Nucleic acid binder design. Structure first.
Ligand SMILES: Nc1nc2c(ncn2[C@H]2C[C@H](O)[C@@H](COP(=O)(O)NP(=O)(O)OP(=O)(O)O)O2)c(=O)[nH]1
Ligand SMILES: [Mg+2]
Ligand SMILES: [Mg+2]
Length: 425
DNA sequence: ATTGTGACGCT
């Protein structure tokens, strides 16, 4: 009753950019705007692999991970932008820099946790307290939430249903109680409207946001009304939402763990989790997962918004599939040097921008026919931002995989260099 | 012959 804490302390938002790499290319190339288009990596093998799709193109069934030739079968007027290639590999620099544009704007409003190239969490609890004090009890106008959806409303066209849901939400608000969680979420959603307006005005990119009380609900909410919309998921809307929410839709249950939850417990939806005691979940899925699951199916999650705007690692990766697998010593050296050269450029820029230095170089390889994605992961010291030195050290650290008596065997299907263990500089 | 990243957990 009174002592059952509800995980309504925080206001957390998740902002994710809509079809981000396509928007970056559409800003640079006006001819792609308001068109079915996608961004691919490479072009020789089946026209390249798609990693980003505009919503127009999605209406035709185009998705990420499709080959571009297959996508063209679904969508014959599809436009394609290609990722830059450098030293024979995909170069994602332009999007990392567009990302930084967006992150720098988000940082003005609150402390953010970069969750990926195109998305960040925001802890808005302090900002909402401030804005609540400034309103001095003034009610909240639907003008202030022009793109906000309220999940589970209305109850009892799209813009119409959205505005109906927003009016039902706003007429039920107790605006006098500075401590009502629902009010706090509302004020958060006003601030997130302002943040998304600033992002679009200062970059031309559009995004969606989830506003809720924790990261998992914010992230789930963010997807509910993409594109170019934001969704408030209240604590009170969790039971209905989760009663038909497949377990795999929750961040981190989309894989092996989620499948075991489904299979062992004999359930399909998030809501059904509430019928198990914490100990039952801890027995089946370990003590941590169990605690996390017991709280999560009630809408409660405690993972903090970490103050971390920058990646913790900087890495360069390239597959060598099938008959392009590296089979000679010269080949492994030339590609370790290409990877090391890109890594060096990125690290030198990181040092000058962010006043820090990586201290550990990780080399990962896959050998042909291996089942695993990574066959060997070995670390060594990183003492200089010198590509020739890094590549030589990667070779020294992996050379004892070669079973040849000039040749390389088994042939390498992946090289991966990664700088980690950063330190102030 | 999705590929290229990046976080975090387990032991
Ligand atoms: N290299 C590479 N880049 C990828 C991959 N997957 C995604 N990206 C890149 C391209 C993506 O633009 C970007 C962000 O990924 P999302 O937020 O998951 N997708 P988006 O923003 O496109 O659409 P939505 O509106 O649904 O959020 O990361 C991949 O497998 N490989
Ligand atoms: Mg996105
Ligand atoms: Mg994303």
């Amino acid at each position: 009753g009174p002592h059952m804490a509800t995980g309504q302390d925080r206001v957390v938002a998740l902002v994710d950019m809509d079809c981000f790499f396509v928007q970056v290319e559409q800003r640079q190339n006006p001819h792609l705007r308001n068109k079915p288009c996608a961004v691919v990596q490479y072009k020789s093998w089946k026209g390249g692999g798609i990693i980003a799709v505009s919503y127009e193109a999605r209406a035709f069934g185009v998705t990420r991970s499709m080959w571009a030739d297959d996508a063209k079968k679904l969508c014959p007027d599809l436009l394609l932008a290609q990722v830059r290639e450098s030293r024979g590999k995909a170069n994602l620099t332009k999007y990392r820099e567009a990302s930084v544009e967006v992150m720098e704007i988000m940082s003005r409003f609150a402390v953010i946790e970069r969750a990926s190239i195109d998305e960040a969490y925001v802890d808005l609890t302090s900002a909402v307290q401030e804005r609540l004090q400034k309103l001095q009890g003034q009610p909240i106008s639907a003008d202030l939430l022009p793109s906000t959806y309220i999940e589970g409303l209305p109850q009892g066209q799209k813009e119409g249903m959205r505005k109906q849901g927003l009016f039902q939400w706003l007429d039920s608000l107790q605006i006098d109680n500075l401590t009502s969680p629902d009010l706090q979420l509302t004020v958060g959603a006003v601030i997130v409207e302002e943040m998304r307006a600033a992002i679009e005005r200062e970059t031309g990119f559009q995004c969606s946001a989830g506003i809720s009380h924790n990261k998992v609900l914010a992230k789930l909410a963010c997807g509910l009304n993409k594109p170019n919309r934001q969704t408030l998921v209240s604590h009170g809307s969790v039971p209905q939402l989760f009663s038909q929410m497949p377990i795999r839709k929750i961040r981190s249950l989309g894989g092996k763990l989620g499948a075991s939850v489904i299979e062992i417990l004999g359930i399909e939806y998030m809501g059904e989790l509430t019928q198990f005691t914490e100990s039952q979940l801890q027995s089946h899925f370990g003590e941590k997962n169990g605690s996390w699951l017991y709280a999560m199916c009630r809408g409660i999650e405690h993972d903090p918004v970490k103050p971390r705007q920058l990646p913790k690692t900087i890495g360069c990766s390239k597959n060598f599939p099938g008959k392009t697998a590296l089979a000679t010593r010269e080949q492994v050296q030339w590609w370790l040097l290409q990877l090391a050269q890109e890594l060096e450029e990125r690290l030198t820029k990181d040092r000058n921008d962010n006043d820090r230095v990586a201290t550990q170089l990780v080399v990962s390889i896959r050998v042909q026919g291996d089942k695993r994605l990574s066959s060997l992961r070995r670390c060594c010291a990183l003492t200089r931002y010198d590509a020739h030195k890094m590549s030589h050290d990667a070779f020294t650290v992996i050379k004892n995989c070669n079973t040849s008596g000039t040749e390389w065997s088994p042939p390498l299907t992946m090289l991966f260099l990664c700088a980690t263990k950063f330190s102030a500089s």
